[PDB]
Amino acid sequence: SQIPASEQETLVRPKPLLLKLLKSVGAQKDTYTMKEVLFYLGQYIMTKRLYDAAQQHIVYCSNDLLGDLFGVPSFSVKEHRKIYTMIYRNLV
Ligand SMILES: CC(C)(O)c1cc(F)c2c(c1)C(=O)N(Cc1ccc(Cl)cn1)[C@@]2(OCC1(CO)CC1)c1ccc(Cl)cc1
């Protein structure tokens, strides 16, 4: 565990462009737990194939709405606090 369970289980309200992202992979609500936000972001990453076999822990999000929301061209899936911070930038 990198992120406490209690923080994972908290209800959050995505800002509009993060909501657009979640809705594009079937999410149907205005509020989600952080763990659910992460699940749908994962579904989005795998759908858009924002990954590469040469560097299997890196999300390659340049030239993608996800990159614009997170403010980076790529990031490591191992860096959970950094990911949470990037998601907090995108919550109401
Ligand atoms: C191939 C690659 C690059 O290694 C890869 C892509 C990917 F999409 C995910 C992982 C790995 C991974 O371990 N995940 C889980 C995770 C990681 C970090 C945090 Cl803080 C929370 N959860 C990702 O989601 C995995 C799902 C949904 O649980 C099945 C689709 C995931 C979710 C969300 C984000 Cl923002 C980033 C990665």
Q: How far apart are CA 81 and CA 1, in angstroms?
A: 11
Number of domains in the chain: 1
Q: CA dist 10 to 5, 6, 34, 37, 42, Å?
A: 9, 7, 6, 11, 18
Residue 7: partners with Cβ closer than 8 Å, 6 or more residues away: 34, 84
Q: How far apart are CA 69 and CA 86, in angstroms?
A: 8
Could you give the 3-state DSSP secondary structure of residue 1? coil
Which domain covers residue 9, as residue numbers? 5-89
Strand 32-33 relative to strand 74-76: parallel, antiparallel, unpaired? unpaired
In this structure, the residue with its CA closest to atom 28 of ligand 1 is: 39
Counting atoms of ligand 1 from 1, which one is nearest the CA of 46?
8
CATH number (domain holding residue 39) = 1.10.245.10
* Mutational test site, ligand 1, from 77, 86, 91, max ligand atoms within 8 Å of CB: 77
